PDB file of C-alpha atoms in Angstrom:
ATOM      1  CA  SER A  19     -18.943 197.780 107.954  1.00  0.00           C
ATOM      2  CA  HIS A  20     -19.711 195.598 105.063  1.00  0.00           C
ATOM      3  CA  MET A  21     -21.179 192.584 106.791  1.00  0.00           C
ATOM      4  CA  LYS A  22     -24.771 191.531 106.852  1.00  0.00           C
ATOM      5  CA  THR A  23     -24.400 189.060 109.651  1.00  0.00           C
ATOM      6  CA  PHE A  24     -23.244 189.802 113.226  1.00  0.00           C
ATOM      7  CA  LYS A  25     -22.724 188.041 116.546  1.00  0.00           C
ATOM      8  CA  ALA A  26     -24.928 189.416 119.321  1.00  0.00           C
ATOM      9  CA  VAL A  27     -23.126 189.416 122.681  1.00  0.00           C
ATOM     10  CA  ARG A  28     -25.495 191.521 124.856  1.00  0.00           C
ATOM     11  CA  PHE A  29     -29.213 192.031 124.937  1.00  0.00           C
ATOM     12  CA  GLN A  30     -31.233 194.571 126.886  1.00  0.00           C
ATOM     13  CA  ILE A  31     -34.819 195.854 127.040  1.00  0.00           C
ATOM     14  CA  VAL A  32     -35.533 199.379 128.124  1.00  0.00           C
ATOM     15  CA  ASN A  33     -38.752 200.804 129.479  1.00  0.00           C
ATOM     16  CA  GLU A  34     -40.227 204.307 129.604  1.00  0.00           C
ATOM     17  CA  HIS A  35     -38.364 205.265 132.632  1.00  0.00           C
ATOM     18  CA  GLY A  36     -35.088 204.228 131.199  1.00  0.00           C
ATOM     19  CA  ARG A  37     -34.759 201.081 133.209  1.00  0.00           C
ATOM     20  CA  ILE A  38     -32.767 198.299 131.685  1.00  0.00           C
ATOM     21  CA  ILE A  39     -33.511 194.644 131.969  1.00  0.00           C
ATOM     22  CA  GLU A  40     -30.482 192.729 130.637  1.00  0.00           C
ATOM     23  CA  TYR A  41     -30.807 189.068 129.676  1.00  0.00           C
ATOM     24  CA  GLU A  42     -27.772 186.783 129.780  1.00  0.00           C
ATOM     25  CA  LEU A  43     -27.173 185.301 126.320  1.00  0.00           C
ATOM     26  CA  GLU A  44     -26.488 181.650 125.650  1.00  0.00           C
ATOM     27  CA  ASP A  45     -26.199 182.568 121.986  1.00  0.00           C
ATOM     28  CA  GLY A  46     -26.963 185.439 119.637  1.00  0.00           C
ATOM     29  CA  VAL A  47     -27.046 186.377 115.967  1.00  0.00           C
ATOM     30  CA  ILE A  48     -28.480 189.415 114.198  1.00  0.00           C
ATOM     31  CA  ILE A  49     -28.884 189.645 110.402  1.00  0.00           C
ATOM     32  CA  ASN A  50     -29.339 192.732 108.251  1.00  0.00           C
ATOM     33  CA  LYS A  51     -32.166 191.775 105.907  1.00  0.00           C
ATOM     34  CA  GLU A  52     -32.025 194.474 103.278  1.00  0.00           C
ATOM     35  CA  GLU A  53     -32.834 191.945 100.583  1.00  0.00           C
ATOM     36  CA  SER A  54     -36.379 192.686 101.341  1.00  0.00           C
ATOM     37  CA  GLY A  55     -36.925 195.887 103.165  1.00  0.00           C
ATOM     38  CA  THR A  56     -37.539 193.724 106.056  1.00  0.00           C
ATOM     39  CA  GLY A  57     -35.212 195.260 108.630  1.00  0.00           C
ATOM     40  CA  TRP A  58     -33.119 193.014 110.849  1.00  0.00           C
ATOM     41  CA  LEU A  59     -33.648 189.602 112.443  1.00  0.00           C
ATOM     42  CA  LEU A  60     -32.350 188.880 115.938  1.00  0.00           C
ATOM     43  CA  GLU A  61     -32.172 185.316 117.232  1.00  0.00           C
ATOM     44  CA  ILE A  62     -31.106 184.707 120.828  1.00  0.00           C
ATOM     45  CA  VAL A  63     -31.028 181.811 123.244  1.00  0.00           C
ATOM     46  CA  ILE A  64     -31.790 182.514 126.899  1.00  0.00           C
ATOM     47  CA  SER A  65     -33.037 180.778 130.034  1.00  0.00           C
ATOM     48  CA  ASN A  66     -36.619 179.418 130.197  1.00  0.00           C
ATOM     49  CA  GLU A  67     -37.071 181.501 133.268  1.00  0.00           C
ATOM     50  CA  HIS A  68     -38.316 184.342 131.039  1.00  0.00           C
ATOM     51  CA  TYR A  69     -40.792 182.305 128.983  1.00  0.00           C
ATOM     52  CA  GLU A  70     -43.909 184.111 130.317  1.00  0.00           C
ATOM     53  CA  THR A  71     -42.595 187.644 129.834  1.00  0.00           C
ATOM     54  CA  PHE A  72     -41.788 186.954 126.165  1.00  0.00           C
ATOM     55  CA  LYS A  73     -44.925 184.919 125.544  1.00  0.00           C
ATOM     56  CA  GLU A  74     -46.942 187.908 126.760  1.00  0.00           C
ATOM     57  CA  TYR A  75     -44.864 190.250 124.522  1.00  0.00           C
ATOM     58  CA  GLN A  76     -45.686 188.080 121.531  1.00  0.00           C
ATOM     59  CA  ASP A  77     -49.402 187.821 122.408  1.00  0.00           C
ATOM     60  CA  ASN A  78     -49.828 191.603 122.780  1.00  0.00           C
ATOM     61  CA  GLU A  79     -47.540 192.377 119.820  1.00  0.00           C
ATOM     62  CA  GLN A  80     -45.636 194.576 122.288  1.00  0.00           C
ATOM     63  CA  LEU A  81     -43.292 197.170 120.783  1.00  0.00           C
ATOM     64  CA  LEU A  82     -39.938 196.664 122.501  1.00  0.00           C
ATOM     65  CA  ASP A  83     -37.109 199.198 122.752  1.00  0.00           C
ATOM     66  CA  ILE A  84     -33.969 197.087 122.683  1.00  0.00           C
ATOM     67  CA  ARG A  85     -30.212 197.494 122.847  1.00  0.00           C
ATOM     68  CA  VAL A  86     -27.955 195.007 121.050  1.00  0.00           C
ATOM     69  CA  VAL A  87     -24.150 194.959 121.490  1.00  0.00           C
ATOM     70  CA  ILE A  88     -22.275 193.514 118.587  1.00  0.00           C
ATOM     71  CA  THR A  89     -19.189 191.275 118.347  1.00  0.00           C
ATOM     72  CA  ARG A  90     -17.527 192.464 121.495  1.00  0.00           C
ATOM     73  CA  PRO A  91     -19.238 193.395 124.714  1.00  0.00           C
ATOM     74  CA  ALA A  92     -17.438 196.711 125.278  1.00  0.00           C
ATOM     75  CA  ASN A  93     -18.969 198.116 122.078  1.00  0.00           C
ATOM     76  CA  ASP A  94     -21.699 200.737 121.862  1.00  0.00           C
ATOM     77  CA  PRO A  95     -25.220 199.263 121.626  1.00  0.00           C
ATOM     78  CA  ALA A  96     -27.190 199.516 118.446  1.00  0.00           C
ATOM     79  CA  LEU A  97     -30.748 200.746 118.954  1.00  0.00           C
ATOM     80  CA  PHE A  98     -33.788 198.845 117.636  1.00  0.00           C
ATOM     81  CA  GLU A  99     -37.538 198.872 117.894  1.00  0.00           C
ATOM     82  CA  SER A 100     -38.844 195.311 117.754  1.00  0.00           C
ATOM     83  CA  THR A 101     -41.573 192.709 118.258  1.00  0.00           C
ATOM     84  CA  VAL A 102     -41.351 189.021 119.154  1.00  0.00           C
ATOM     85  CA  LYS A 103     -41.913 186.928 116.005  1.00  0.00           C
ATOM     86  CA  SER A 104     -41.467 183.360 117.319  1.00  0.00           C
ATOM     87  CA  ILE A 105     -40.544 181.466 120.508  1.00  0.00           C
ATOM     88  CA  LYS A 106     -39.206 177.966 120.966  1.00  0.00           C
ATOM     89  CA  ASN A 107     -39.133 176.568 124.498  1.00  0.00           C
ATOM     90  CA  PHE A 108     -36.602 173.933 125.405  1.00  0.00           C
ATOM     91  CA  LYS A 109     -35.660 172.115 128.598  1.00  0.00           C
ATOM     92  CA  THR A 110     -33.790 174.969 130.291  1.00  0.00           C
ATOM     93  CA  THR A 111     -33.580 177.497 127.535  1.00  0.00           C
ATOM     94  CA  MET A 112     -35.659 179.254 124.982  1.00  0.00           C
ATOM     95  CA  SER A 113     -34.950 180.549 121.500  1.00  0.00           C
ATOM     96  CA  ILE A 114     -36.525 183.857 120.472  1.00  0.00           C
ATOM     97  CA  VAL A 115     -36.590 185.515 117.056  1.00  0.00           C
ATOM     98  CA  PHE A 116     -37.367 189.273 116.950  1.00  0.00           C
ATOM     99  CA  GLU A 117     -38.361 191.475 114.028  1.00  0.00           C
ATOM    100  CA  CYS A 118     -36.158 194.549 114.331  1.00  0.00           C
ATOM    101  CA  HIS A 119     -35.943 197.986 112.738  1.00  0.00           C
ATOM    102  CA  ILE A 120     -32.811 199.993 113.481  1.00  0.00           C
ATOM    103  CA  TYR A 121     -32.758 203.626 114.609  1.00  0.00           C
ATOM    104  CA  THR A 122     -30.361 206.460 115.453  1.00  0.00           C
ATOM    105  CA  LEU A 123     -30.611 208.589 118.502  1.00  0.00           C
ATOM    106  CA  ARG A 124     -32.193 211.883 117.653  1.00  0.00           C
ATOM    107  CA  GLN A 125     -30.361 215.191 117.847  1.00  0.00           C
ATOM    108  CA  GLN A 126     -31.081 217.253 120.975  1.00  0.00           C
ATOM    109  CA  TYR A 127     -31.933 214.076 122.965  1.00  0.00           C
ATOM    110  CA  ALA A 128     -30.653 215.610 126.209  1.00  0.00           C
ATOM    111  CA  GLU A 129     -32.823 218.730 125.710  1.00  0.00           C
ATOM    112  CA  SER A 130     -35.965 216.798 124.796  1.00  0.00           C
ATOM    113  CA  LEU A 131     -35.382 214.371 127.644  1.00  0.00           C
ATOM    114  CA  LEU A 132     -35.136 217.250 130.107  1.00  0.00           C
ATOM    115  CA  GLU A 133     -38.236 218.874 128.609  1.00  0.00           C
ATOM    116  CA  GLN A 134     -40.200 215.662 129.109  1.00  0.00           C
ATOM    117  CA  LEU A 135     -39.070 215.129 132.755  1.00  0.00           C
ATOM    118  CA  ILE A 136     -39.908 218.708 133.741  1.00  0.00           C
ATOM    119  CA  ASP A 137     -43.337 218.508 132.045  1.00  0.00           C
ATOM    120  CA  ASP A 138     -43.898 215.416 134.212  1.00  0.00           C
ATOM    121  CA  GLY A 139     -43.159 217.632 137.260  1.00  0.00           C
ATOM    122  CA  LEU A 140     -39.807 216.202 138.425  1.00  0.00           C
ATOM    123  CA  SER A 141     -37.383 218.359 140.399  1.00  0.00           C
ATOM    124  CA  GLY A 142     -34.142 218.430 142.367  1.00  0.00           C
ATOM    125  CA  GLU A 143     -32.656 215.042 143.162  1.00  0.00           C
ATOM    126  CA  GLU A 144     -35.365 212.920 141.487  1.00  0.00           C
ATOM    127  CA  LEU A 145     -34.730 214.932 138.336  1.00  0.00           C
ATOM    128  CA  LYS A 146     -30.907 214.394 138.419  1.00  0.00           C
ATOM    129  CA  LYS A 147     -31.597 210.731 139.209  1.00  0.00           C
ATOM    130  CA  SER A 148     -33.912 210.119 136.281  1.00  0.00           C
ATOM    131  CA  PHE A 149     -31.945 212.288 133.853  1.00  0.00           C
ATOM    132  CA  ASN A 150     -28.760 210.424 134.451  1.00  0.00           C
ATOM    133  CA  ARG A 151     -30.282 207.007 134.117  1.00  0.00           C
ATOM    134  CA  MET A 152     -32.204 207.957 131.085  1.00  0.00           C
ATOM    135  CA  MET A 153     -29.179 209.549 129.502  1.00  0.00           C
ATOM    136  CA  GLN A 154     -27.466 206.201 129.455  1.00  0.00           C
ATOM    137  CA  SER A 155     -30.379 203.907 128.580  1.00  0.00           C
ATOM    138  CA  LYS A 156     -31.971 206.299 126.133  1.00  0.00           C
ATOM    139  CA  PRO A 157     -35.631 205.334 126.260  1.00  0.00           C
ATOM    140  CA  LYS A 158     -37.924 206.347 123.380  1.00  0.00           C
ATOM    141  CA  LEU A 159     -39.402 209.678 124.277  1.00  0.00           C
ATOM    142  CA  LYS A 160     -43.103 210.281 125.008  1.00  0.00           C
ATOM    143  CA  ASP A 161     -43.406 212.390 121.840  1.00  0.00           C
ATOM    144  CA  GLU A 162     -42.878 209.207 119.780  1.00  0.00           C
ATOM    145  CA  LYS A 163     -45.635 207.021 121.369  1.00  0.00           C
ATOM    146  CA  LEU A 164     -49.445 206.938 120.685  1.00  0.00           C
TER     147      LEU A 164
ATOM    148  CA  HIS B  20     -25.558 175.960 123.323  1.00  0.00           C
ATOM    149  CA  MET B  21     -23.246 178.404 121.489  1.00  0.00           C
ATOM    150  CA  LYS B  22     -24.035 178.142 117.779  1.00  0.00           C
ATOM    151  CA  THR B  23     -22.702 181.487 116.394  1.00  0.00           C
ATOM    152  CA  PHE B  24     -18.998 182.376 116.553  1.00  0.00           C
ATOM    153  CA  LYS B  25     -16.422 184.874 115.401  1.00  0.00           C
ATOM    154  CA  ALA B  26     -14.144 183.748 112.536  1.00  0.00           C
ATOM    155  CA  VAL B  27     -10.663 185.148 112.988  1.00  0.00           C
ATOM    156  CA  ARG B  28      -8.611 183.414 110.243  1.00  0.00           C
ATOM    157  CA  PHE B  29      -9.546 182.193 106.796  1.00  0.00           C
ATOM    158  CA  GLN B  30      -7.456 180.108 104.369  1.00  0.00           C
ATOM    159  CA  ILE B  31      -7.908 178.198 101.141  1.00  0.00           C
ATOM    160  CA  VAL B  32      -5.761 175.197 100.536  1.00  0.00           C
ATOM    161  CA  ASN B  33      -5.159 174.064  97.009  1.00  0.00           C
ATOM    162  CA  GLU B  34      -4.333 170.652  95.569  1.00  0.00           C
ATOM    163  CA  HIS B  35      -0.678 171.100  96.269  1.00  0.00           C
ATOM    164  CA  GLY B  36      -0.844 171.759  99.936  1.00  0.00           C
ATOM    165  CA  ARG B  37      -0.463 175.435  99.438  1.00  0.00           C
ATOM    166  CA  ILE B  38      -2.093 177.854 101.837  1.00  0.00           C
ATOM    167  CA  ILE B  39      -3.663 181.081 100.622  1.00  0.00           C
ATOM    168  CA  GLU B  40      -4.471 183.279 103.630  1.00  0.00           C
ATOM    169  CA  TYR B  41      -6.769 186.311 103.300  1.00  0.00           C
ATOM    170  CA  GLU B  42      -6.708 189.019 105.949  1.00  0.00           C
ATOM    171  CA  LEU B  43     -10.151 189.636 107.436  1.00  0.00           C
ATOM    172  CA  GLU B  44     -11.987 192.817 108.129  1.00  0.00           C
ATOM    173  CA  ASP B  45     -14.597 190.648 109.797  1.00  0.00           C
ATOM    174  CA  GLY B  46     -16.006 187.186 109.975  1.00  0.00           C
ATOM    175  CA  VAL B  47     -18.739 185.168 111.535  1.00  0.00           C
ATOM    176  CA  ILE B  48     -19.533 181.482 111.236  1.00  0.00           C
ATOM    177  CA  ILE B  49     -22.814 179.807 112.189  1.00  0.00           C
ATOM    178  CA  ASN B  50     -23.390 176.153 112.965  1.00  0.00           C
ATOM    179  CA  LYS B  51     -26.569 175.214 111.162  1.00  0.00           C
ATOM    180  CA  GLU B  52     -26.347 171.451 111.285  1.00  0.00           C
ATOM    181  CA  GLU B  53     -29.676 171.082 112.971  1.00  0.00           C
ATOM    182  CA  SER B  54     -31.133 172.275 109.773  1.00  0.00           C
ATOM    183  CA  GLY B  55     -28.843 170.158 107.658  1.00  0.00           C
ATOM    184  CA  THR B  56     -27.072 172.996 105.865  1.00  0.00           C
ATOM    185  CA  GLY B  57     -23.825 172.506 107.695  1.00  0.00           C
ATOM    186  CA  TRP B  58     -22.130 175.762 108.595  1.00  0.00           C
ATOM    187  CA  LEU B  59     -22.588 179.297 107.266  1.00  0.00           C
ATOM    188  CA  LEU B  60     -19.649 181.644 107.008  1.00  0.00           C
ATOM    189  CA  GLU B  61     -19.543 185.322 106.115  1.00  0.00           C
ATOM    190  CA  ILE B  62     -16.261 187.216 105.697  1.00  0.00           C
ATOM    191  CA  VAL B  63     -15.179 190.605 104.472  1.00  0.00           C
ATOM    192  CA  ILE B  64     -11.890 190.769 102.606  1.00  0.00           C
ATOM    193  CA  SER B  65     -10.162 192.838  99.975  1.00  0.00           C
ATOM    194  CA  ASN B  66     -11.792 192.807  96.620  1.00  0.00           C
ATOM    195  CA  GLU B  67      -8.600 192.604  94.715  1.00  0.00           C
ATOM    196  CA  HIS B  68      -9.269 189.015  93.742  1.00  0.00           C
ATOM    197  CA  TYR B  69     -12.965 189.520  92.992  1.00  0.00           C
ATOM    198  CA  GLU B  70     -12.583 187.693  89.671  1.00  0.00           C
ATOM    199  CA  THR B  71     -11.103 184.647  91.423  1.00  0.00           C
ATOM    200  CA  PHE B  72     -14.114 184.352  93.694  1.00  0.00           C
ATOM    201  CA  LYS B  73     -16.679 185.071  90.975  1.00  0.00           C
ATOM    202  CA  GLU B  74     -15.087 182.200  89.088  1.00  0.00           C
ATOM    203  CA  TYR B  75     -15.460 179.864  92.088  1.00  0.00           C
ATOM    204  CA  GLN B  76     -19.098 180.844  92.442  1.00  0.00           C
ATOM    205  CA  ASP B  77     -19.908 180.359  88.814  1.00  0.00           C
ATOM    206  CA  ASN B  78     -18.075 177.019  88.572  1.00  0.00           C
ATOM    207  CA  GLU B  79     -19.497 176.049  91.986  1.00  0.00           C
ATOM    208  CA  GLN B  80     -15.946 175.127  92.821  1.00  0.00           C
ATOM    209  CA  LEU B  81     -15.435 172.909  95.847  1.00  0.00           C
ATOM    210  CA  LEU B  82     -13.048 174.619  98.222  1.00  0.00           C
ATOM    211  CA  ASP B  83     -11.011 173.084 100.980  1.00  0.00           C
ATOM    212  CA  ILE B  84     -10.916 175.812 103.660  1.00  0.00           C
ATOM    213  CA  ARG B  85      -9.491 176.288 107.148  1.00  0.00           C
ATOM    214  CA  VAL B  86     -11.305 178.565 109.603  1.00  0.00           C
ATOM    215  CA  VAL B  87      -9.928 179.586 112.997  1.00  0.00           C
ATOM    216  CA  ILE B  88     -12.854 180.190 115.338  1.00  0.00           C
ATOM    217  CA  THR B  89     -13.107 182.670 118.262  1.00  0.00           C
ATOM    218  CA  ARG B  90      -9.449 182.872 119.290  1.00  0.00           C
ATOM    219  CA  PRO B  91      -6.318 182.642 117.136  1.00  0.00           C
ATOM    220  CA  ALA B  92      -5.170 180.207 119.793  1.00  0.00           C
ATOM    221  CA  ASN B  93      -7.294 177.484 118.323  1.00  0.00           C
ATOM    222  CA  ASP B  94      -6.282 175.239 115.457  1.00  0.00           C
ATOM    223  CA  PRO B  95      -8.329 175.603 112.324  1.00  0.00           C
ATOM    224  CA  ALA B  96     -11.497 173.654 111.729  1.00  0.00           C
ATOM    225  CA  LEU B  97     -11.577 171.939 108.327  1.00  0.00           C
ATOM    226  CA  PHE B  98     -14.389 172.688 105.846  1.00  0.00           C
ATOM    227  CA  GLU B  99     -15.374 171.731 102.340  1.00  0.00           C
ATOM    228  CA  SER B 100     -17.280 174.677 100.960  1.00  0.00           C
ATOM    229  CA  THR B 101     -18.722 176.666  98.041  1.00  0.00           C
ATOM    230  CA  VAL B 102     -19.298 180.372  97.465  1.00  0.00           C
ATOM    231  CA  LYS B 103     -22.987 181.258  97.897  1.00  0.00           C
ATOM    232  CA  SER B 104     -22.866 184.987  97.400  1.00  0.00           C
ATOM    233  CA  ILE B 105     -20.674 188.004  96.808  1.00  0.00           C
ATOM    234  CA  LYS B 106     -21.329 191.626  97.571  1.00  0.00           C
ATOM    235  CA  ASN B 107     -18.682 193.958  96.130  1.00  0.00           C
ATOM    236  CA  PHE B 108     -17.836 197.369  97.644  1.00  0.00           C
ATOM    237  CA  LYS B 109     -15.178 200.030  97.021  1.00  0.00           C
ATOM    238  CA  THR B 110     -12.018 198.123  98.085  1.00  0.00           C
ATOM    239  CA  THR B 111     -13.593 195.278 100.085  1.00  0.00           C
ATOM    240  CA  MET B 112     -16.048 192.479  99.359  1.00  0.00           C
ATOM    241  CA  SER B 113     -18.282 190.269 101.480  1.00  0.00           C
ATOM    242  CA  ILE B 114     -18.512 186.586 100.731  1.00  0.00           C
ATOM    243  CA  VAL B 115     -20.862 183.970 102.090  1.00  0.00           C
ATOM    244  CA  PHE B 116     -19.866 180.293 101.926  1.00  0.00           C
ATOM    245  CA  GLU B 117     -21.900 177.133 102.511  1.00  0.00           C
ATOM    246  CA  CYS B 118     -19.660 174.781 104.515  1.00  0.00           C
ATOM    247  CA  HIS B 119     -19.587 171.156 105.669  1.00  0.00           C
ATOM    248  CA  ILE B 120     -17.034 170.368 108.385  1.00  0.00           C
ATOM    249  CA  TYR B 121     -14.829 167.262 108.329  1.00  0.00           C
ATOM    250  CA  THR B 122     -12.351 165.303 110.403  1.00  0.00           C
ATOM    251  CA  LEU B 123      -8.994 164.294 109.030  1.00  0.00           C
ATOM    252  CA  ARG B 124      -8.798 160.738 107.702  1.00  0.00           C
ATOM    253  CA  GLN B 125      -6.753 158.106 109.557  1.00  0.00           C
ATOM    254  CA  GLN B 126      -3.326 157.293 108.045  1.00  0.00           C
ATOM    255  CA  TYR B 127      -3.244 160.676 106.337  1.00  0.00           C
ATOM    256  CA  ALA B 128       0.598 160.717 106.376  1.00  0.00           C
ATOM    257  CA  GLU B 129       0.893 157.289 104.765  1.00  0.00           C
ATOM    258  CA  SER B 130      -1.608 158.189 102.011  1.00  0.00           C
ATOM    259  CA  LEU B 131       0.058 161.538 101.326  1.00  0.00           C
ATOM    260  CA  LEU B 132       3.436 159.806 100.926  1.00  0.00           C
ATOM    261  CA  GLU B 133       1.860 157.236  98.606  1.00  0.00           C
ATOM    262  CA  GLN B 134       0.477 159.981  96.344  1.00  0.00           C
ATOM    263  CA  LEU B 135       3.718 161.998  96.242  1.00  0.00           C
ATOM    264  CA  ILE B 136       5.804 158.927  95.342  1.00  0.00           C
ATOM    265  CA  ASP B 137       3.219 157.886  92.737  1.00  0.00           C
ATOM    266  CA  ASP B 138       3.413 161.405  91.242  1.00  0.00           C
ATOM    267  CA  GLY B 139       7.191 160.889  90.620  1.00  0.00           C
ATOM    268  CA  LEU B 140       8.636 162.799  93.597  1.00  0.00           C
ATOM    269  CA  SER B 141      11.878 161.936  95.394  1.00  0.00           C
ATOM    270  CA  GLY B 142      14.765 163.460  97.301  1.00  0.00           C
ATOM    271  CA  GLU B 143      14.573 167.028  98.522  1.00  0.00           C
ATOM    272  CA  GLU B 144      11.413 167.623  96.469  1.00  0.00           C
ATOM    273  CA  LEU B 145       9.613 164.852  98.285  1.00  0.00           C
ATOM    274  CA  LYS B 146      10.535 166.205 101.747  1.00  0.00           C
ATOM    275  CA  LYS B 147       9.683 169.793 100.872  1.00  0.00           C
ATOM    276  CA  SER B 148       6.203 168.824  99.516  1.00  0.00           C
ATOM    277  CA  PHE B 149       5.490 166.335 102.284  1.00  0.00           C
ATOM    278  CA  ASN B 150       6.406 168.802 105.050  1.00  0.00           C
ATOM    279  CA  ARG B 151       4.144 171.434 103.581  1.00  0.00           C
ATOM    280  CA  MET B 152       1.270 169.154 102.834  1.00  0.00           C
ATOM    281  CA  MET B 153       1.466 167.760 106.343  1.00  0.00           C
ATOM    282  CA  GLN B 154       0.803 171.313 107.633  1.00  0.00           C
ATOM    283  CA  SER B 155      -1.996 172.414 105.280  1.00  0.00           C
ATOM    284  CA  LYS B 156      -3.533 168.918 104.898  1.00  0.00           C
ATOM    285  CA  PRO B 157      -5.108 169.079 101.401  1.00  0.00           C
ATOM    286  CA  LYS B 158      -7.699 166.607 100.098  1.00  0.00           C
ATOM    287  CA  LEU B 159      -5.956 163.794  98.345  1.00  0.00           C
ATOM    288  CA  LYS B 160      -6.441 162.715  94.794  1.00  0.00           C
ATOM    289  CA  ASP B 161      -8.464 159.704  95.835  1.00  0.00           C
ATOM    290  CA  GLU B 162     -11.076 162.225  96.848  1.00  0.00           C
TER     291      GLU B 162
END
């Protein structure tokens, strides 16, 4: 793809346990800012309902593991690590800009993911349960945190 | 609410009512009126006519464009635009345009006819040109 500007049609945030919170988009754009080595800029419009969550993310400079689907909703998510840069609250909606850096899923994800879950002591049905959910959501692995 | 859209067709219309369609790899258009920059359009097309677009950018040529938004089912929105940037690849290029949307003047038909007659046209030539210009809808000489 040769474009530097894309329409964002789905937005999700994933936690450690591979649990997705999806936010319904009013609007969405994401720009590849290579001009500086500044990464990517995501601007979305969502309901005000989530103003506190995102205000707290901004205040703590929370590192967020996000999934962004581009152009058409059936497409495979792109993977970013991001922080909230600015928030604008409106009457029923809010506008949020994120600072994003793209990443590719590592090789041997399935093997590392299993190694992590077993080292956390999971077994049998809880293990199948977590592995399957995590295989789809793809959380950042414990060996990448601090 | 929705401010960012897919751009599915792109055309330039010249003085003569002639449509020049370019097939898109991709396109997005963004409504930035709140800012006051009008709309922002990025497209990827073949780079065969790179020199044509470099020329427009250098001359800051004012282009009368038609953009179909979201679905091909829609009729094109009318823009007056200039080329802001070009990124050239192997056999494609990406172009960004600054655009300002516009509505078609009232009595367009009557003014078109006036111009064609004043330019010496008659008979079959007049009908041919009028029928085409009524489809593409170019800016008139009174500008």
